[PDB]
């Protein structure tokens, strides 16, 4: 997904699927559309839900990636708190 700004409905579906690869790919697809500068908050609860505690680095690294380029803007699955869904289980 080079740059496709309407694809956020499919990404939500792909983000949790019971297959780790699909989830990684989805979250990756979100990153590439934001970096170009395209739509991203719809997904947030889905994105945040699988990855949170785990020591399994790749999804964690992917989520960690998305928190330095848009964390502030996206708020469906995060909202505003001191120990946000950016860092609460990332302790």
């Amino acid at each position: 997904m080079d740059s496709e700004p309407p694809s956020e409905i499919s990404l939500k579906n792909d983000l949790e699927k019971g297959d780790v690869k699909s989830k990684t790919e989805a979250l990756k697809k979100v990153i590439i559309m934001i970096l170009n500068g395209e739509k991203l908050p719809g997904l947030l609860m889905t994105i945040i839900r699988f990855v949170l505690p785990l020591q399994d680095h790749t999804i964690k690294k992917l989520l960690l990636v998305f928190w330095e380029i848009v964390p502030k803007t996206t708020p469906d699955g995060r909202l505003l708190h001191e120990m946000i869904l950016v860092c609460d289980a990332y302790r």
Partner: peptide, 11 residues
Amino acid sequence: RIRSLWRHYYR
């Protein structure tokens, strides 16, 4: 801290 995070598990 965690209580604030349950909403991600709702769906």
